[PDB]
């Protein structure tokens, strides 16, 4: 019967999204064959390589890269120049327009270049391009790996910074991973001499085909695992043999929590600890002031459905279980706890009326037995001696599938099975046709 203000926080199932700078050198070699006045294109091959670390620093400092790439293979240095120009030209990063939702790219070269070769001789020309992509990388708890919008997967926690090995996963090679404090990065890659922002810690990883850089942030500062779902000031609290029940008619749902309270000093509630309190205080200063007072301290409960409840009555660790996406079951409790709280109370309003009534009649019989014992004898024999029908039938519910499985498989414009089958068909067309 006691009342309190509750704040329901849902599990942060949305992946933490951050900005990742992908630096990549695109070597696009176009080979053609020239014969008299007609040139025959012999083909093209495009590869992505990781620019050197000093070039990454130069890009982050000046928004400019170099038109030359060097790679060490078997002790031999192979150098590729842009447009077969053997100079050391420094090229600026200019935008390539496009939309790509949230995949803005800055490229030094915006047009493919290729010149025809000499007569009776094939010529191959390089089209090295310095591309920096500000991609959106999403990670999910326990954040052992994060992947960008493109096809890049890394086995490194976004918060690992060398000294956080025991608390943050790190499965990639330590040789390819670097940490730089007080690192300077350009604010805008599109123009040179842009403002250089300083960051406390930046992590770099030399991938096979590119270099992935990200600004290191504290896990408990920007990657909190609880998201505010809804606050309810008018909530009825009840106790049952194994559960605390919090029923809110604003959302028409009741949540059941175990017979224990989560410690307020838990490490998973940090960014919420103040926030969940603050809103509560705001509520205490918005709807139930003056005439009401805070009964007890703020408590934390974990419901059986996975939701988190911050409770403050007004007059011991969290688990890894996630919240249920569909909350109708909670509404089901609201369909029960109400009726269970109604029908029983109705009985408490009928039997209490009945027991008195049977008493009131009984005294009428008590004297009547002295005058007319026939009524008492009939009552104790329940036989002579000498309301409404029930439309509550069996309403067996059927499976109301609004959309069939065929309709469910065609909700989105992309189907993974069809794409994989098309890729297999492409492989067959390029290999099996031979």
């Amino acid at each position, epitope marked *: 019967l006691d009342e309190g203000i509750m704040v329901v926080y849902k599990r942060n199932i949305v992946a933490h999204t951050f900005k990742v700078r992908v630096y990549q050198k695109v070597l696009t070699f176009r080979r053609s064959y020239a014969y008299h006045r007609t040139t025959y294109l012999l083909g093209s091959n495009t590869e992505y390589v990781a620019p050197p670390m000093w070039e990454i620093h130069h890009i982050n400092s000046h928004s400019q890269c170099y038109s030359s790439y060097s790679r060490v293979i078997a002790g031999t240095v192979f150098v590729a120049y842009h447009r077969d120009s053997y100079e050391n030209k420094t090229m600026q990063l200019m935008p390539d327009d496009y939309s790509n939702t949230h995949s803005t790219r800055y490229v030094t070269v915006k047009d493919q270049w290729h010149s025809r070769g000499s007569t009776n001789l094939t010529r191959e020309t390089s089209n090295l391009n310095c591309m920096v992509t500000i991609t959106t990388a999403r990670s999910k708890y326990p954040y052992h790996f994060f992947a960008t919008s493109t096809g890049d997967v890394v086995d490194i926690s976004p918060f690992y910074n060398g000294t956080n090995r025991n608390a943050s996963y790190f499965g990639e090679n330590a040789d390819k991973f670097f940490i730089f404090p*007080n690192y300077t990065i350009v604010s805008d890659f599109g*123009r*040179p*001499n*842009s403002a*250089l922002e*300083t960051h406390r810690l930046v992590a770099f990883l030399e991938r096979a085909d590119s270099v992935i850089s990200w600004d290191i942030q504290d896990e408990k500062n920007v990657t909190c695992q609880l998201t505010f779902w809804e606050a309810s000031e008018r909530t009825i609290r009840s106790e049952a043999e194994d559960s605390y029940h919090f029923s809110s008619a604003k959302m028409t749902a009741t949540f059941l929590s175990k017979k224990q309270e989560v410690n307020m000093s838990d490490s998973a509630l940090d960014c919420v600890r103040d926030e969940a309190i603050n809103k509560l205080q705001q509520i205490f200063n918005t709807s139930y002031n003056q005439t009401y007072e805070k009964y007890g301290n703020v408590s934390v409960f974990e419901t059986t459905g996975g939701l988190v409840v911050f409770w403050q009555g007004i007059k011991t660790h969290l688990s890894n279980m996630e919240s249920v996406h569909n909350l109708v079951y909670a509404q089901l409790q609201f369909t029960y706890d109400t009726l269970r709280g109604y029908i029983n109370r109705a009985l408490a309003q009928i039997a209490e009326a009945w027991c008195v009534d049977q008493r009131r009649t009984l005294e009428v019989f008590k004297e009547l037995s002295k005058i007319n014992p026939s009524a008492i004898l009939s009552a104790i024999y329940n036989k002579p001696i000498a309301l409404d029908i029930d439309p509550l039938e069996n309403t067996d519910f059927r499976v109301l599938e609004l959309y069939s499985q065929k309709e469910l498989r065609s909700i989105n414009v992309f189907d993974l099975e069809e794409i994989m089958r098309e890729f297999n068909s492409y492989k067959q067309r390029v290999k099996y046709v031979e």
Partner: antibody
Framework: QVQLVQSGAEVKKPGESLKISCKGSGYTFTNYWIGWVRQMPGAGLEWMAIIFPRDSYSAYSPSFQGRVTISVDKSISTAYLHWSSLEASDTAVYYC???????????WGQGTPLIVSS | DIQMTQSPSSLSASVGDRVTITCRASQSITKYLNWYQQKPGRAPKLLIHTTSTLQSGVPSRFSGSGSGTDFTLTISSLQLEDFGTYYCQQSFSTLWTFGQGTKLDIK
């Protein structure tokens, strides 16, 4: 955006060495390049030293070879200008600036006038 | 080496007159082409940057534009404190080229 305060006016005769201190005020930075210039009456500013924030190399190809030495440091970035063999042509106002703080903002220092007089 | 010409060399105007000053150079690309402001006995201070953004603290009475190798700075209304020496310059990486600077004064 960064004030880049500089030491007050200094008076020194030619021949000996000149020391100038230029504090990196405004905000603790290790990103904005440092430029030391001099200005004389009748003309504008002329570049004399362009160096990185966290260190210095005293890049001077066409002007005053060996006459300028800059050290600076990290974090607070306290720039130190040192001049050897001071000449009469060096009587001018020296300025320290950051190359770009925000939106191509080259904020100059207060300016130290090296002037020889009585 | 590159050339730089800021025009006019010297000019005069009354209070509250729109004035345009031009800057020309042989730069390969646009670079930045910022515009400054200086007074006799005072350190130089910026006015405009990138031909699209202005220094904080300077009101919107100044504007900038450019085309080809020419860049113009326009003032809607001249004030008493607006008279002084103005400069245009280019700056890329660490290389920096400065301008002679126009002089604005009132008789």
């Amino acid at each position: 955006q960064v004030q880049l305060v500089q030491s007050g006016a200094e008076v020194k005769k030619p021949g000996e060495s000149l020391k100038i201190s230029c504090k990196g005020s405004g905000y603790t930075f290790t990103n904005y390049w440092i430029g030391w210039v001099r200005q004389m009456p009748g003309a504008g500013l002329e570049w004399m030293a362009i160096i990185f924030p966290r260190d210095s190399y005293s890049a001077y190809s066409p002007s005053f070879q060996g006459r300028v030495t800059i050290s600076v440091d990290k974090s607070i970035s306290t720039a130190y200008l040192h001049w050897s063999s001071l000449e009469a042509s060096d009587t001018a106002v020296y300025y320290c600036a950051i190359y770009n703080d925000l939106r191509s903002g080259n904020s100059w220092g207060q300016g130290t006038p090296l002037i020889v007089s009585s | 080496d590159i050339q730089m010409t800021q025009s006019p060399s010297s000019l005069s105007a009354s209070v509250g007159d729109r004035v345009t000053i031009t800057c020309r150079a042989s730069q390969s690309i646009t670079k930045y082409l910022n515009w400054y402001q200086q007074k006799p006995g005072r350190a130089p201070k910026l006015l405009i940057h990138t031909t699209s953004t202005l220094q904080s603290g300077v009101p919107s009475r100044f504007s900038g534009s450019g085309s080809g190798t020419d860049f113009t700075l326009t003032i809607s209304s001249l004030q008493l404190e607006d008279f002084g020496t103005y400069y245009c310059q280019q700056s890329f990486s660490t290389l920096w080229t400065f301008g002679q600077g126009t002089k604005l004064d009132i008789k």
